Every structure is written in structure tokens, then in C-alpha cells.
Paper text:
M. pneumoniae binds to host target cells by means of a polar structure known as the attachment organelle, and glides in the direction of this differentiated structure at a speed of ~1 µm/s. P1, together with the P40/P90 polypeptides, forms a transmembrane complex called the “Nap”. In the present work, we report the structures of M. pneumoniae proteins P1 and P40/P90 and of complexes of P40/P90 bound to sialylated oligosaccharides. The structural results reveal that P1 (1627 residues) and P40/P90 (1218 residues) present a similar overall organization and topology in the extracellular regions.
Crystals were obtained of the M. pneumoniae Nap protein P1 extracellular region (residues Thr29-Asp1521). This P1 construct, empirically chosen after many crystallization attempts, excludes the predicted N-end of the signal secretion peptide (spanning residue Met1 to Leu59 according to the structural properties prediction program Psipred26). In this construct are also excluded the (predicted) transmembrane and intracellular regions at the C-end of P1 (residues Tyr1522 to Ala1627). The structure of P1 consists of a large N-terminal domain, with Asn60 as the first residue visible in the X-ray and the cryo-EM maps, and a smaller C-terminal domain (residues Gly1395–Asp1521). The N-terminal domain of P1 has a β-sheet propeller topology of seven consecutive blades or β-sheets, each with four antiparallel strands, except for β-sheet VII that contains only two strands. The longest intra and inter β-sheet connections cluster together creating a crown-like structure on one side of the β-propeller opposite to the position where the C-terminal domain is located. In the crown there are 13 disordered loops, spanning 117 residues, which could not be built. The C-terminal domain contains only one disordered loop (residues Thr1483–Asn1495) and has an elongated fold with the same unique topology (according to DALI29) as the C-terminal domain of adhesin P110 from M. genitalium. In the crystal structure, the C-terminal domain is anchored by crystal contacts and the density is clear and crisp, while in the top part of the crown, with few crystal contacts, temperature factors are high and chain tracing was difficult.
Author numbering: 60 to 101, 106 to 227, 231 to 258, 269 to 276, 283 to 297, 301 to 336, 349 to 830, 848 to 869, ...
């Protein structure tokens, strides 16, 4: 009873693995099989004990590995729970005892630690490339397979309000402006005090850190970085503070905790770890099976190699000033705080606060703070590897030599709607030469990717991938796989970049006016995208609390610390630098002091990110700033890795003292960014692992914006560009303004201005009209921008400092004759701003673009709205204008928020892609079919109470399929897009670098999948077909079942209960409030975007209306959009599965050479505009495909199938959906081995065995082939060969395999399965016989 007919194929979600096709010497397939009708783990709810759950699962579920032959016929099952395996014997050289007929030599004994690991279930197989009969089998506990049935979600912090006390906070956000501590007024930093009013030796801020030369050691005498004249505020006696208690007590609000702690898995490795067993397999042999050993992937093998700083992730190398500055601003402290990342903490949310950092943060003496501690009580929670994060890292086996590598999976195995468990590193099982012993290790990706520099990529530069000696950047992946492309090892999937969203730091008294940024910094709002709320930012985020106040008790502490405004910045001319920087510059390394220059700094999004994010440079381990780490994967990622180094690297990482944070504040002050790896360490030996990397396209940022506009939004098929004709559109002096491009938007201005370049302003222009009344200036005068016409242009009341300047002069022998500020400023500082000539005024940036691209494919880019689309609060097409004639006269008709939206895009353009208010409001057939959702500029004295929302698609950045290879390209399914890296392994000049094939929303079946509440639950894997096209299969039974049951039928739970649904893209967004007066302009400048948009401080009364807060439940938006598509004329019986195939792309597809042969951004724009061809769904005409390489599936490439799919069995000759269908042919059936008695005795058995075959080729000589086999005259003898499997000169036996030819023209030679009743092989004997008396001829 070899085949258990109760078991059928299945697909492991973490890797998309169902079967492994086997070619070569031991062909056919291995397939995952299980009892697909078992319920698994079996709304009031209950808590499931792991031990009991696993035991219940062992008794109620059945799993096996099913062996298939080359034709696709099932041979036998290996159910490890019922198998009685034996270890194979070896010979004197340590090689496995093996004969192709007898099989493996068996020892009579089961493997060591067998009966404790036998109940684990197989979820992957990888064939040893150096032994076709050897396989690595990955086994996991049954509980891991059914983990999603436990419904262990992550919850919100308990709120003492609701909105939608006071402050208008939603979803438990703690927000209150910080206040001046009157008892710590002396702790204000002091300058160097008279004449010159705009600056402060002569005028810098002094910071001193000095130790006692008297009375471990040190204990400190003075620590100016401990100073805090500003503190958190009180609410009902107690001070407003982040507490792990906010999530409830562990045993209604329950904190999220891992199902099993790291130590619980470690202490019961046979029961709870993932294990690699070594299996021997030979389906045509007598002893067909043997199991050598089992090796456990102990999570502690990985944690033992974690950088030492990971024991203390609430701390960073900036130490006390940074802990204090973040804590006072109601942010999380350190580089990997448990409030943002509870998945990697054994305590989960029970340790989610800024307390117990492993360093003194609250001593009664300031000079005792910043000290590293021992004890057992106040010791930190370390980055660990608990149940969910550990099993996220289990999958994708890759062999290289004697090393078996485990890269991890996409994290779907243990994911929850609001958690993001991912792969933190790579495990390795390194076997010795004979396979009698092995060693197990894990190394984090932080350590493996530690040599990253800009020149390693052909795509986006300056991306937040840089690191430092402290390993503050923690890259984590949703892994597609690790595949060999020729000899090159390619690792790909999605990755978490360093945090950029919370790099700008708000002024201590600006928190209550900027709730979204506070929420992102707090760990509440799990949004990695940069949001556009700059008015309240501090001019720079790297100043200590001592620099925030001033003994002069004026509006903040300008020029040092003030409201960020690039219009107020000092120009770096020789005299400005000489006066304010140079008298302090060469003193920062003397008598224990550091200085904050009286130089006025400021800049927009690209500038904040350039200076204080972990941007890649040309030098590795050079990130002086690693703000934090992303909540979720937020970039496409592919890396070429050195496999020889992976195979050879040591098991135990030896870190140095250079990797540890300083033991006190004195040593930290006198720290050096780059420090030499110390003697006896090996951590630096891991930096050469990664040789090259990709983030998708091979384009510069501003060119990628053009391509992003060409991409359709998978939700309805409309492009982010809204079919904008670029330079040939009517948005400059069928179509709408684009989301990402500035080309043909606003005016093309001849620039130089600040410090010829023909550049487009984009939407949100603020150009001065000029003293003529006709031609609009190519800039904004500093006069127009900074005037008091409380004031957004100058809230801190700064003043202007040979034609004389504007008084308040300084030192030197020149004293001034030129103003410190610039006179001509760029005419755009809104989110669409892209100034290559001015980093200080640019908002678009590569760190954002890499995210916008990934989110653009998933369809989850947030959109800012203030109209719910309900009858009364509807957005109408009459509310929106786009033509340059309409916009030059009145730019508020554009509905550009320039506050609250996603940075680096045009929000009303995005509103239009999603909701189509303009296009739907332009036809009789439907008429107001649009959901009526949008953002309208507030009128009169009315306020706009806006929120970011997602359109309701449920695709996540962990929706990553298996990695497939085709020529020199690699592909994987990312959400509803099949992504192919055409220019990574072998990059070609002038090629875009990616191919994109998406699901088609115009087809009802594909639309049902695109809009499914669990769309990734449908994925059944990709594979490359014989023609090199990528095929993907989708199961639709779950789509139809989920569509048949609506939980949110008329739900208003988000609006009334201040809670989020279990939708994967439900985010804790906050209200963004702007008064109509902010959109009123000012002297020849009538632009509503002249000043930075000044928001309103949020109070209880500034809450969203219920119908708008209800759109924060993404199913409510989804309901509105599906009503708009609304069509059910179904001919039935409804497709149950779908097979998609990538189209054939031409030789010139993606090639820009013909347009790159007008700036490059302008040429790319025109090329894309030339590739452009009412309704709520865009029709698929197929124009948007070939030439570009970006498009939606044609009808012919999307095959609807009548039955559902759980697993797929593939051999080199057959593809069997659920292991069923037509079985392939290995030959003609008429070609077969002769029976011994039918052989011409004198012509064949008379020879000794060694005469009959070439020992070099191991083939029977052509002259002897017809004597062994029956071959009809119609069949060519060259197509048949006899491979020698065995020979024995003692017994004169000869073991042969009959092989038949296929395509190259003499796969190639394949085993002829129908050769004999038993298969393709047979033993012939005895040879070396004395002659008989002629073979009879009767026929």
C-alpha cells in the first residue's frame, strides 16, 4: 500500500513549493501531498496551547512526499510518521553502498533522534547536485502548516478617547506637545551675548562631555548631552508616555506575543524546530529508500551570530541625546524598537516601550545617565528569533558543494493582517566530505549585505541600504528564492530598507498639529512611505534637547533650531561660511567640546533623507545615521551572492569591541564612525558576500517617475499617469494630470536661480508674476516667500541679515555687502517638487521612489481624501479642474493638498486614477457611477479634515512567489504582477531592466482575484515553460467562497469603535487638518502654494465625520469601488482556477537606444506617451505591452480552468494539476528489452561482459545494441542507446538502462520507462558462456 489515495498535492505558502521536477540520472518528481480534507486546528475565541495543538494535529492530519516517474505516474509515498527507515551503509572510502538494482546498503538501524522528528511534515525537497540519489528534505511542526487558523492578530494601544480627554487622536495614538521644564531652565545650552540679533568664539552652541580625574570608572563630571530643558507633558497627574501596558495585560485588550519564545523552540528542537533530513532515493532499486541523518535548524544558531548591539535595540550610537530627543517627541527610541517591530521580540508587545534600554536613562543625577548596566532586573529585551519570525525564515533550500543553504520564505506561513514576520538571515547545514557529520549556523542579512555601495547597482542610487559598525540597519526579506543563473547565485524578493518616513523630526510643540508623522514615529502607523507634513519639522533632526529652547525665551532657538524652511537657509558663499562655521570648524576635536554653528540650515524631503538617512555611498559601513528600520518590505530586491564564500564562511561569527555601543557617554562623544576590525575577529570577512544588487529597473529616479506613470493601477486598469500626454498635454502654456511626472505640468522655466537647464515646475507652482504683468518669473523672490503676509512664511520671526544687505551685520574685515539668505528661490516646494539644481527644495527622492514602485504594483499607495462619497459628502467632477487655463487663473481648483498626502506624487491625480470622478462624470451610460470619493480644497473659513485611505486591495509586500530562471533573467510573482529582471545577471545598456505582466481588471474572473480579500491565498506557483515564458497558476475556490460571505455588509465598527479590521492594508491613519486660510495667497505672487501649508492643531472637535472615518476600514472603500464596477450577466459555471502566461516580448522591448540616440527624462516621457492608446474599468487593447514591456494579460494568456488547484506535480515531460491528467510518453512502446531466452545466445552470451561496453562512455557498443533489444525497422537505431548501470566480472552480469532520444538531434537521451515491465532497467546474465548450437529462426 505504497500510495495513500487519501493524500493529494498541496502548496506550502511560505515558498509557493508544491513539487520538485527531477531531470538527469534519477528523474521524475517529488511532490508535497497531504490529507486536504483534514480540518487542521479546530467570534468569542480561545487560546490554543502549543503542545496540545501539535498533538491534536499529529492525530488528525496526514502528510507525505510522493515520488513520481519521468512520465508523471505516482510510484510511492514517504509518510515519515509511518516509514521505518534505516541508515545507509558506507564502503571504506565513506561512499554510500549503492547498486542501481539492489539499491542502498541498509544498516538495520533507524537514524539518530528519528522517533522524535518523524511526526514533522515535509514542506520542501532539494536534490544534491553532486549526488542524484541524495535529497535534503525540510520538515516543520504540523502547527506551522496550520498557524493561520490560530487567528493571532496584533492589536492597538488602548485609547482614553476615540475621535471620528481631547487632542483628536485615533486608534490609541498618544499625542501631546512637549513643554519647557521650568526646574531644568539651567540645562539650556549656552552660546560661544549682545549685538547681532540673528545669530548667537562669537556665536555657536557649546556641548561639553568631560569625565572626573578623581572617582568600573569615570561616573562623569559634565554631560551637556544629558541636558533636557524640554520634557513630556502631564495628563490627569501622570506624564504622557509610551508604555508596554498600553497594549493590555498578557494572559479585553490583549498584547501580541509570539506563540512560542526563541528558548522554547531551542529547548525542544525535535518537536518545534525546522529540520533537514538527508534522504536517499532510487525508485527502480530493491532498497529504494535510506535516511542518513537529521539536522535541526536551531533558532539560537542564528541569534548567536546577531551583532552585539541587537541585545540593546532601544539604544543606538547617538546614545543619551537621541534616546531623550525621541522619548520627549513620543517616538520610539533606538534602531529596532519592539513597538515598531514586536515580531522579533520574545515578549512581543509586552516590551513595546522606550524603557529598560540596557543603559541608564532616568538617574536622579544627569552625570550618572548614559551608563551601561549589569544586573538582571533593568536588562533589555534583545532582538531574538521567536516562532513567527523563525518560521518566516524557513524555506528555499539551495545547495552549493557540501553546503545546504536556507534563505527563508515570504513570511506568509506565520503572518497576521497587522504583523510582518520576514527572513532575517540565512541558515546553513555544512556537511563533511562523506556526509557522516554536519554543522548548523545562521547569519543575519545585516552581516551578509554589510559591503553595500552605490556602484553595485545599475538602478536607483543613494537608497537606504548603508550600515555601520553597530549594524543599526536590519535588512529583512520576503524571499522569492535563491537560484543559480549559469554559475551566478541570485537571491531575490522584497526587502526592508532603512527608515526614511520618520527621519525629519517635528518641533517639540508641533506634535498636536501633525498626528500622522507622530503615529509613524510611535510604532502605531505601520506606513513606511514618507508623508507630506513639513511645516512643523525642525530645520534639522540631529540637535539635542539642550539646543531646542534658549535662555532668551524667544520663538524656538533660531538660527540653530527653528521651523524648517528652505527659503530661510543661508547661502554657502565664502563670507557666510567664514563668519558662522570656520571660527568653530577646527575646534570640534579639542578640549572635550563640540559646536552647533550659527549657520541657518533647512531643506525639504530629499535633503532631510540625504543628510540623516542610511543612504548608500561609495564607502561601506559609513552610515552615521540609521534612523530606524522599515515596518514591512518596501523595495523590490535582487542580489548576486558569492556561493564559494557562503560554503566556506565560519559557523561562529567573532564580533569585536568596535561592534559594541560605548559603555558610557564620554567614550561615545569621542567615537569614530569607522573603526578597524580588531585582531582575531571574522565579522569583516562577510562583507564580500554580495557582489551586485538590483531594485528593479535600471533607471535614474526622474526617469523612473516617467515609467511609474505608464503602470496601470491593478484595481481598475487605469494608469497612474491618467494617460497624460506630457509635453503635448494642455496642463502647460481621455487625459488628466499624472501622478508622478512633472513633464508638461506647470511651466518649463529656464533655471539657475538659487545656486541652460530647462526644467518643468510640476503642479503646485509658486512663480512670481514679475514687474511687467505678462511673463511669469522662472523663480520665487525671497521677498514674496518670507514676508509676514501666525505667518507660514516666517513663524519664528527671523530677519534679513557695493549694494548694502538688510542690516544686522557680523564680524570679519568685509562685515557683509551681500545677504546671508538667497534672493531667487525655486518656484515649487510641494510634494511634486523635483529640482536637480536644488537638493534643498526637492521633495521627490529615490528612497521614496523604490517604495512608490513596490506599492504601485501592489495597488496600495495611500490617497488623501476629505469627501466620503456618501450622499451629502460627495466629490463631483465640477469640484476638479486640470487645464492650464483653469489652473493659472485659480490653482486651488487643482485640489493639491500639499499637506497630509504621500510625499513625491500629485494626490488629485491619484484620486482620479482610483475613483475616476472626472471620467465617470462624462457619460450618460452609467451617469455618476463613480464612488464620489476625493479631496477638495476647503472654501470660506471652513476646515478640511482629511485622512489618508487605501482603495481596499489586499495585496501585501510579502506576496512574493517562487524565483524562476529563463536564460539570463529571473522572475517572480509580486502580488498581481509577474516581475522579470531582464537586465541584472547580464545587464544591457539602454534597457529599462524589468518586464511587468499584470492581472486584467476588465475580465470579471481576473477582477475577482485582484479584489479578493485573501488574494495571495490563491497563488499556486510559477514555472518557466519550454518556450521560456513564465506560467503562473491561481486557485479561485477561496476567492468565490470569500465573495459569498460578507462580514462588513453594513459595518461601521471603525467609525464608532476606533478599531481597525483584520484587512492587511488597514493602517492607523490620523486626521490632517488645514484651515481654508492656508490656501489663500499674499509682492506679485497670488499662489496658494507660495508658503508651506500651515496645519491646524488637532482638538477633539477636529475629528473626522463617521462616514469618512469608516473609509479607514479598507473593505468600505472596496465595497464602493465594486458597486461602481457592478455587472453580473454570468453565463457560468464560474472558473475555479486560472493559468497566466507572460507574452512573447520582442528584441527591442524595453530598449531606449532609439530614443536615447531634450533631456533624457524628456525623451523617455515622449517614448512612453507614444505608447499610449469613460468606463470604470480600463479596456485592455494590448497597446500597453510590447515595446515597453509593461502591461496587463491579454485574454489568450489568461486561461480559465473548470476545476480548483491545491498543488501542481511537474516532471521534465509533464505538468499535472493536482497530480492528475495525461501521463507523458518516454518512447515508442515497440522498443523493449528482449527476454533472455529470446536473445541470440552465440552472438551475445558468449562474450565476457567487458567486451560489450565502452568503459569510458559506459555505453554498450553500437554493434551489440540490436542483440539486447526489440526494435522495429521503422525506428532509427541511433535514437536508442544502452547505458551500463552495473557489471560484475565474477558472476558475468550486466545491468542496462534503455534510453530513447528527444530534441538536440544526435531533454536528450531519456530512460525508456516501457523498456521492461519494471521500468527502464534490467540485469542480463550469465555472460562469458561457451557456445550453444545456433539460435532458432521461426518468427
Amino acid at each position: 500500500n505504497a500510495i495513500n489515495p487519501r493524500l493529494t498535492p498541496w502548496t506550502y505558502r511560505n515558498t509557493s513549493f508544491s513539487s520538485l521536477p527531477l531531470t538527469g540520472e534519477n528523474p521524475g518528481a517529488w511532490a508535497l501531498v497531504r490529507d486536504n480534507s483534514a480540518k487542521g486546528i479546530t467570534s468569542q475565541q480561545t487560546t490554543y496551547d502549543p503542545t496540545r495543538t501539535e498533538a491534536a494535529l499529529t492525530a488528525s492530519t496526514t502528510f507525505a512526499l510522493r515520488r513520481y516517474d519521468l512520465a508523471g505516474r505516482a510510484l510511492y509515498d514517504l509518510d515519515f510518521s509511518k516509514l521505518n527507515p534505516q541508515t545507509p551503509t558506507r564502503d571504506q572510502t565513506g561512499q554510500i553502498t549503492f547498486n542501481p538494482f539492489g539499491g542502498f546498503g541498509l544498516s538495520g538501524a533507524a537514524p539518530q533522534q528519528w522517533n522524535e522528528v518523524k511526526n514533522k511534515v515535509p514542506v520542501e525537497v532539494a536534490q544534491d547536485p553532486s549526488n542524484p540519489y541524495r535529497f535534503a528534505v525540510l520538515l516543520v511542526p504540523r502547527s506551522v502548516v496550520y498557524y493561520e487558523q490560530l487567528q493571532r492578530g496584533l492589536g492597538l494601544p488602548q485609547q482614553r478617547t476615540e475621535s471620528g480627554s481631547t487632542t483628536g487622536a485615533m486608534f490609541g495614538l498618544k499625542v501631546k506637545n512637549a513643554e519647557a521644564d521650568t526646574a531644568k531652565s539651567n540645562e539650556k545650552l549656552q552660546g560661544a551675548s549682545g549685538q547681532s540679533t540673528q545669530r548667537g568664539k562669537v556665536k555657536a552652541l557649546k556641548i561639553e562631555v568631560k569625565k572626573k580625574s578623581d572617582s568600573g570608572q569615570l561616573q562623569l563630571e559634565k554631560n551637556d548631552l544629558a541636558n533636557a530643558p524640554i520634557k513630556r507633558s502631564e495628563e490627569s497627574g501622570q506624564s504622557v508616555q509610551l508604555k508596554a501596558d498600553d497594549f493590555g495585560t498578557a494572559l479585553s485588550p490583549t498584547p501580541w506575543r509570539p506563540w512560542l519564545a526563541t528558548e522554547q523552540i531551542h529547548k525542544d528542537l525535535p518537536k518545534w524546530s525546522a529540520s533537514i533530513l538527508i534522504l536517499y532515493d532510487a525508485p527502480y532499486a530493491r532498497n529504494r529508500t535510506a535516511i542518513d541523518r537529521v539536522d535541526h535548524l536551531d533558532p539560537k544558531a542564528m541569534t548567536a551570530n546577531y551583532p552585539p548591539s541587537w541585545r540593546t535595540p532601544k539604544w543606538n550610537h547617538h546614545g543619551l541625546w537621541d534616546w531623550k530627543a525621541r522619548d520627549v517627541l513620543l517616538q520610539t527610541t533606538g534602531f529596532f524598537n519592539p513597538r515598531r517591530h514586536p515580531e522579533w521580540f520574545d515578549g512581543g508587545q509586552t516590551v513595546a516601550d522606550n524603557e529598560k534600554t540596557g543603559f541608564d536613562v532616568d538617574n536622579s543625577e544627569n552625570t550618572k545617565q548614559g551608563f551601561q548596566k549589569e544586573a538582571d532586573s533593568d536588562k533589555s529585551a534583545p532582538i531574538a528569533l521567536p516562532f513567527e519570525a523563525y518560521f518566516a525564515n524557513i524555506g528555499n533550500l539551495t545547495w552549493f558543494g557540501q553546503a545546504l543553504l536556507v534563505f527563508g520564505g515570504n513570511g506568509h506561513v506565520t503572518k497576521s493582517a497587522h504583523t510582518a514576520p520576514l527572513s532575517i538571515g540565512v541558515f546553513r547545514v555544512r556537511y563533511n566530505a562523506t556526509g557522516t557529520s554536519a554543522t548548523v549556523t545562521g547569519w543575519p542579512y545585516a552581516l551578509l549585505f554589510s559591503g553595500m555601495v552605490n556602484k553595485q547597482t545599475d538602478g536607483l542610487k543613494d537608497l537606504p541600504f548603508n550600515n555601520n559598525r553597530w549594524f543599526e540597519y536590519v535588512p529583512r526579506m520576503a524571499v522569492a528564492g535563491a537560484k543559480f543563473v549559469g554559475r551566478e547565485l541570485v537571491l531575490a524578493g522584497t526587502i526592508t530598507m532603512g527608515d526614511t518616513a520618520t527621519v525629519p523630526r517635528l518641533l517639540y510643540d508641533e506634535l498636536e498639529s501633525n498626528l500622522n508623522l507622530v503615529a509613524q514615529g510611535q510604532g502605531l502607523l505601520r506606513e513606511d512611505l514618507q508623508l507630506f507634513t513639513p511645516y512643523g519639522w525642525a530645520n534639522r533632526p540631529d540637535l539635542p534637547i539642550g539646543a531646542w529652547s534658549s535662555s532668551s525665551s524667544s520663538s524656538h532657538n533660531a538660527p540653530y533650531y527653528f521651523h524648517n524652511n528652505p527659503d530661510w537657509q543661508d547661502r554657502p558663499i565664502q563670507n557666510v561660511v567664514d563668519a558662522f562655521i570656520k571660527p568653530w570648524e577646527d575646534k570640534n576635536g579639542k578640549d572635550d567640546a563640540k559646536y552647533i554653528y550659527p549657520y541657518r540650515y533647512s531643506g525639504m524631503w530629499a535633503w532631510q533623507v540625504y543628510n540623516w538617512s542610511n543612504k548608500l555611498t561609495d564607502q561601506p559601513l559609513s552610515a552615521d545615521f540609521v534612523n530606524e528600520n522599515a515596518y514591512q518590505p518596501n523595495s523590490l530586491f535582487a542580489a548576486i551572492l558569492n556561493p564559494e564564500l557562503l560554503a566556506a564562511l565560519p559557523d561562529k561569527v567573532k564580533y569585536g569591541k568596535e561592534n559594541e555601543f560605548a559603555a558610557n557617554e564620554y567614550e561615545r562623544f569621542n567615537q569614530k564612525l569607522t573603526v578597524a576590525p580588531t585582531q582575531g575577529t571574522n565579522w569583516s570577512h562577510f562583507s564580500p558576500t554580495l557582489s551586485r544588487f538590483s531594485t528593479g529597473f535600471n533607471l535614474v529616479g526622474s526617469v523612473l517617475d516617467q515609467v511609474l506613470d505608464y503602470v496601470p493601477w491593478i484595481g481598475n486598469g487605469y494608469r497612474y499617469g491618467n494617460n497624460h500626454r506630457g509635453v503635448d498635454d494642455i496642463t502647460a502654456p481621455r487625459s488628466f494630470l499624472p501622478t508622478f511626472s512633472n513633464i508638461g505640468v506647470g511651466l518649463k522655466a529656464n533655471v539657475q536661480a538659487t545656486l541652460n537647464l530647462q526644467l518643468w515646475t510640476g503642479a503646485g507652482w509658486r512663480n512670481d508674476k514679475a514687474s511687467s504683468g505678462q511673463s511669469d518669473e522662472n523663480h520665487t523672490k525671497f521677498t514674496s516667500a518670507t514676508g509676514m503676509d501666525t505667518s507660514a512664511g516666517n513663524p519664528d520671526s527671523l530677519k534679513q541679515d557695493s549694494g548694502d544687505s538688510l542690516t544686522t551685520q557680523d564680524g570679519n574685515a568685509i562685515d557683509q555687502q551681500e545677504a546671508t539668505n538667497y534672493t531667487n528661490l525655486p518656484p515649487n516646494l510641494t510634494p511634486t517638487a523635483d529640482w536637480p539644481n536644488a537638493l534643498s527644495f526637492t521633495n521627490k527622492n529615490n528612497a521614496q521612489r523604490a517604495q512608490l514602485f513596490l506599492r504601485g504594483l501592489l495597488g496600495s499607495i495611500p490617497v488623501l481624501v476629505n469627501r466620503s462619497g456618501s450622499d451629502s459628502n460627495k466629490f463631483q467632477a465640477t469640484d476638479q479642474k486640470w487645464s492650464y487655463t483653469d489652473l493659472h487663473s485659480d490653482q486651488t481648483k487643482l485640489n493639491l493638498p500639499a499637506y497630509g498626502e504621500v510625499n513625491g506624487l500629485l494626490n488629485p491625480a491619484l484620486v482620479e486614477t482610483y475613483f475616476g470622478n472626472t471620467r465617470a462624470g462624462g457619460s450618460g451610460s452609467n451617469t455618476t457611477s463613480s464612488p464620489g470619493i476625493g479631496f477638495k480644497i476647503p472654501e470660506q473659513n471652513n476646515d478640511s479634515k482629511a485622512t489618508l485611505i487605501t482603495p481596499g486591495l489586499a495585496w501585501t509586500p510579502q506576496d512574493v512567489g517562487n524565483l524562476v530562471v529563463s536564460g539570463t533573467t529571473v522572475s517572480f510573482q509580486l502580488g498581481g504582477w509577474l516581475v522579470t529582471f531582464t537586465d541584472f545577471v547580464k545587464p544591457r545598456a539602454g534597457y529599462l531592466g524589468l518586464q511587468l505582466t499584470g492581472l486584467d481588471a476588465s475580465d470579471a474572473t481576473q477582477r475577482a482575484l485582484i479584489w479578493a480579500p485573501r488574494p495571495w491565498a490563491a497563488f499556486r506557483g510559477s514555472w518557466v515553460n519550454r518556450l521560456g515564458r513564465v506560467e503562473s497558476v491561481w486557485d479561485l475556490k477561496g476567492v468565490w467562497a470569500d465573495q459569498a460571505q460578507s462580514d462588513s455588509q453594513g459595518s461601521t465598527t471603525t467609525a464608532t469603535r476606533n478599531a481597525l479590521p483584520e484587512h492587511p492594508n488597514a493602517l492607523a491613519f490620523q486626521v490632517s487638518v488645514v484651515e481654508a486660510s492656508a490656501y489663500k495667497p499674499n509682492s506679485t505672487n497670488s499662489s496658494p502654494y507660495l508658503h508651506l501649508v500651515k496645519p491646524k492643531k488637532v482638538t477633539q472637535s477636529d475629528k473626522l465625520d463617521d462616514d469618512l472615518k469608516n473609509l479607514l476600514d479598507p473593505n468600505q472603500v472596496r465595497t464602493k469601488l465594486r458597486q461602481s464596477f457592478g455587472t453580473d450577466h454570468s453565463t457560468q459555471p464560474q472558473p475555479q482556477s486560472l493559468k497566466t502566461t507572460t507574452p512573447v516580448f520582442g528584441t527591442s522591448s524595453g530598449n531606449l537606444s532609439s530614443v536615447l540616440s531634450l533631456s533624457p527624462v524628456e525623451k523617455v516621457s515622449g517614448w512612453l506617451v507614444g505608447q499610449l492608446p469613460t468606463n470604470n474599468l480600463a479596456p485592455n487593447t494590448n497597446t500597453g505591452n510590447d515595446v515597453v514591456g509593461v502591461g496587463r494579460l491579454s485574454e489568450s494568456n489568461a486561461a480559465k480552468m473548470n476545476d480548483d488547484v491545491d498543488g501542481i506535480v511537474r516532471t521534465p515531460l509533464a505538468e499535472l494539476l493536482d497530480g492528475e491528467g495525461q501521463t507523458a510518453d518516454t518512447g515508442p512502446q515497440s522498443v523493449k528489452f528482449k527476454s533472455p531466452d529470446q536473445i541470440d545466445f552465440n552472438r551475445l552470451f558468449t562474450h565476457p561482459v567487458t567486451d560489450l561496453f565502452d568503459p569510458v562512455t559506459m555505453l554498450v557498443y553500437d554493434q551489440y545494441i540490436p542483440l539486447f533489444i526489440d526494435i522495429p525497422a521503422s525506428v532509427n537505431p541511433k535514437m536508442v542507446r544502452l547505458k551500463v548501470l552495473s557489471f560484475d566480472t565474477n558472476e558475468q552480469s550486466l545491468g542496462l538502462r534503455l534510453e530513447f532520444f528527444k530534441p538536440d538531434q544526435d531533454g536528450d537521451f531519456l530512460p525508456l520507462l516501457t523498456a521492461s515491465s519494471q521500468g527502464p532497467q534490467t540485469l542480463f546474465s550469465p555472460f562469458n558462456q561457451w557456445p550453444d548450437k545456433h539460435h532458432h529462426h521461426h518468427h
